[PDB]
Amino acid sequence: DYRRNVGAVADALLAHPGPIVVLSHENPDGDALGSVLGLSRALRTLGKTVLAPMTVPHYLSFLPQPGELTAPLESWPQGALAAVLDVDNNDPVRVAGADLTQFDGPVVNVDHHGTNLRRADAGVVDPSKPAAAMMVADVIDALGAPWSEAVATPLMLGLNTDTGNFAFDSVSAETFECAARLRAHGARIGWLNDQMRQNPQSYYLLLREVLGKLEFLHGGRVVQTRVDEEMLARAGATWEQVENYVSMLRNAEGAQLAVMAKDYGDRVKFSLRSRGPVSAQNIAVALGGGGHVPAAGATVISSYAEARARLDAAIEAELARVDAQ
Amino acid sequence: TPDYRRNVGAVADALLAHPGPIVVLSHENPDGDALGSVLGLSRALRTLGKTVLAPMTVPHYLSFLPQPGELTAPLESWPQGALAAVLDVDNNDPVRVAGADLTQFDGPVVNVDHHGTNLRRADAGVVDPSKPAAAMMVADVIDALGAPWSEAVATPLMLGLNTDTGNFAFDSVSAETFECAARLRAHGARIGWLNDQMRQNPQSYYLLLREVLGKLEFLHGGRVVQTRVDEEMLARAGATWEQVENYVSMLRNAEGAQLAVMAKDYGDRVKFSLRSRGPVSAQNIAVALGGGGHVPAAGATVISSYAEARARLDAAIEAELARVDAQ
Ligand SMILES: [Mg+2]
Ligand SMILES: [Mg+2]
Ligand SMILES: [Mg+2]
Ligand SMILES: [Mg+2]
Numbered sequence: 001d002y003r004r005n006v007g008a009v010a011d012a013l014l015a016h017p018g019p020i021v022v023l024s025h026e027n028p029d030g031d032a033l034g035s036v037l038g039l040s041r042a043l044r045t046l047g048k049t050v051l052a053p054m055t056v057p058h059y060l061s062f063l064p065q066p067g068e069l070t071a072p073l074e075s076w077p078q079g080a081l082a083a084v085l086d087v088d089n090n091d092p093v094r095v096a097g098a099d100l101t102q103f104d105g106p107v108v109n110v111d112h113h114g115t116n117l118r119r120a121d122a123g124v125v126d127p128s129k130p131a132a133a134m135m136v137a138d139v140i141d142a143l144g145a146p147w148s149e150a151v152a153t154p155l156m157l158g159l160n161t162d163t164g165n166f167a168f169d170s171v172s173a174e175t176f177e178c179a180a181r182l183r184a185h186g187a188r189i190g191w192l193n194d195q196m197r198q199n200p201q202s203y204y205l206l207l208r209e210v211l212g213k214l215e216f217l218h219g220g221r222v223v224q225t226r227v228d229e230e231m232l233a234r235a236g237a238t239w240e241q242v243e244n245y246v247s248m249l250r251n252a253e254g255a256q257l258a259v260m261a262k263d264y265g266d267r268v269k270f271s272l273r274s275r276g277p278v279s280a281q282n283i284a285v286a287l288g289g290g291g292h293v294p295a296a297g298a299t300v301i302s303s304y305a306e307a308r309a310r311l312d313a314a315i316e317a318e319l320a321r322v323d324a325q
Numbered sequence: 326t327p328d329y330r331r332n333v334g335a336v337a338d339a340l341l342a343h344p345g346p347i348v349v350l351s352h353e354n355p356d357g358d359a360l361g362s363v364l365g366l367s368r369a370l371r372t373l374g375k376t377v378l379a380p381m382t383v384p385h386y387l388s389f390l391p392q393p394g395e396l397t398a399p400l401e402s403w404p405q406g407a408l409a410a411v412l413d414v415d416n417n418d419p420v421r422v423a424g425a426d427l428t429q430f431d432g433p434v435v436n437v438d439h440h441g442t443n444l445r446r447a448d449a450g451v452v453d454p455s456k457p458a459a460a461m462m463v464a465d466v467i468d469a470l471g472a473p474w475s476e477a478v479a480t481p482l483m484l485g486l487n488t489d490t491g492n493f494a495f496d497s498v499s500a501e502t503f504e505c506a507a508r509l510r511a512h513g514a515r516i517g518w519l520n521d522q523m524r525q526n527p528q529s530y531y532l533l534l535r536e537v538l539g540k541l542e543f544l545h546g547g548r549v550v551q552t553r554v555d556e557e558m559l560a561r562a563g564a565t566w567e568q569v570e571n572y573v574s575m576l577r578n579a580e581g582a583q584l585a586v587m588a589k590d591y592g593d594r595v596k597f598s599l600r601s602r603g604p605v606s607a608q609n610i611a612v613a614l615g616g617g618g619h620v621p622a623a624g625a626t627v628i629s630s631y632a633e634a635r636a637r638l639d640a641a642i643e644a645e646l647a648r649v650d651a652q
Contacts, residue, residue, distance in 0.1 A: 160494075164520075165492040165493065165494060166487075166492060166493050166506070166516070167492065167516070167517070167520035168516075168517065168520075169516060169517030171510065171516050172510065173507040173508070173510045173511040174507070175507075175510075176503045176504070176506040176507035176510060177503070177504070177507045179493070179503040179506075180500040180501070180502075180503035180504045180507065181500075183498065183499065183500045183502075183503060184500040189493070189494060189495075189496065189498050190494070190495060190496030190497075190498075191496075192494075193491070193494035193495075197578045198578055198579075198580045199578050199579060199580060200580050201543055201547060201579065201580070201581075204538060204541055204579065205541075207534075207538060208535065208538040208539065208541065211531060211534060211535040211538065212535065214531060214535070216528050248526075251524040251525065251526050252526055252528070252531070253525045253526060253527050253528070254528075275521070
């Protein structure tokens with residue numbers, strides 16, 4: 001069925017005579033941007049007219065060339081087809097650059113999220129692939145293989161970012177084979193990573209702050225850090241940059257729990273990473289929230305001291321969880 | 326290539342045919358490729374019933390990878406009838422071969438290496454600088470050995486592949502590099518565990534980073550980034566001078582910067598590491614302080630206090646930028 005559906009997506013794209021609007025999810029990541037650019041370039045080499053509305057984050061701005069990605073679409077072009085990647089088309093609120101609730105043309109979808117409703121004129125959803133870019137590569141082969149370096153490179157970038165440079169346990173042998181194909185097509189791995197290593201002054205100044213509120217507590221097995229808007233003002237950064245430090249704190253030794261705490265002032269908004277025989281969703285269901293399986297995310301509308309005490313009690317609760325299991 | 330496959334075959338042949346002990350060696354201060362290649366070949370050779378000694382000193386950050394008592398201390402003499410299997414280094418470069426003294430040995434030597442400077446002289450050998458990790462080539466040798474594959478063999482070879490390619494990020498990564506990773510992963514290489522263990526940072530790392538970042542400085546409008554580390558900072562952090570080595574690179578990553586400078590202040594002298602981009606020559610700046618190097622990567626040791634040294638480094642920086650802009 002994977003093969004048959006990759007084929008149906010590609011056939012629908014090949015058969016479409018009008019413009020093709022290529023879309024991904026709001027706040028696009030490397031997989032989103034990379035899948036949209038790879039598919040867009042492949043379709044343009046075949047002579048398709050493509051619109052790709054997307055707001056490029058700065059750390060990814062080296063990749064698009066002028067006029068490849070546009071501002072959000074005012075209105076849908078006549079005879080358009082929508083190719084939605086790395087997100088569910090049945091979730092318009094999460095699809096950025098065009099409003100799918102105002103469109104009635106054919107819709108095609110390529111996604112690797114298990115939450116997908118699996119409803120489109122032609123679609124392929126495969127949670128066992130760790131990046132939509134892998135799936136888009138298979139579509140491009142099914143389109144007639146319009147390969148070039150310009151197509152391969154953005155797809156390799158999305159393979160990279162969605163697997164954390166081939167570090168996550170989602171990486172299968174098939175993931176590596178796809179990277180081998182992409183490299184043979186010309187993907188510029190060295191250039192990609194020289195570009196992805198660049199960091200703004202904001203990053204360093206904010207990481208000086210983030211580390212300023214760091215403590216190795218619980219006798220040595222839990223780490224905790226904290227960020228306020230003054231710290232953001234002194235670093236010259238934004239709140240969407242604090243989401244690059246909880247990963248580094250999970251990496252601490254002799255520890256089990258790495259807690260980030262965003263302190264807007266009138267509420268605390270947590271990100272609680274962990275590792276080992278400790279779960280971080282038995283603290284996100286012990287003070288409320290949502291997420292994925294090992295992740296977390298809980299908002300306490302109190303001030304700073306109180307929310308942290310609530311969190312510490314929930315952590316001793318996961319501690320009894322460990323003492324029991 | 327037939328040459329490559331013939332030499333892989335000759336190396337496996339010499340290993341299978343040898344009746345006595347096989348001493349498996351790599352270079353001093355082993356990296357992930359050295360340890361991972363030594364462990365993969367040693368484990369494979371043991372499933373074929375061979376007597377293997379693997380003398381190696383493992384650095385702390387890699388000590389998760391060997392089984393306890395899998396490696397030995399350096400050999401103070403050679404077992405009778407031994408063969409030396411030298412990986413990830415040239416056997417004609419004995420100073421760099423750690424764990425045994427190859428100038429005292431004249432039994433059979435086998436070599437598996439991927440550096441171009443290798444003299445290519447061994448009783449059986451294969452050198453291929455187009456392979457980005459010796460662990461790739463060791464995997465090919467294990468195929469030619471006929472040894473049973475398993476997670477124990479595949480996992481250490483996967484680490485060497487990771488560490489020598491920078492997690493598949495260097496320009497040396499080829500299609501066949503990824504084809505090798507796929508094959509290792511299919512054999513059970515524990516990719517998640519490996520990257521967990523490689524990102525296990527002691528408290529010292531974070532404290533030292535805070536201190537280093539505490540002295541970070543952006544100068545000349547972002548073009549120049551600069552910091553330093555002294556003994557007080559290492560005392561406060563519980564850190565070593567060794568841990569001050571991944572910092573000149575994290576600084577070169579600063580956007581808009583054409584020059585990164587790290588200064589190590591030992592009380593009586595200051596060692597400067599300089600990296601530059603675009604038109605800025607780190608060499609000219611280093612030569613002005615008494616040092617030198619390549620155009621984008623240079624160094625100098627000034628025998629003074631940090632204050633005196635910094636003033637002279639600022640002066641040398643101003644001249645270089647002034648030359649660049651006047652061009
Ligand atoms: Mg995404
Ligand atoms: Mg994705
Ligand atoms: Mg090496
Ligand atoms: Mg090597």
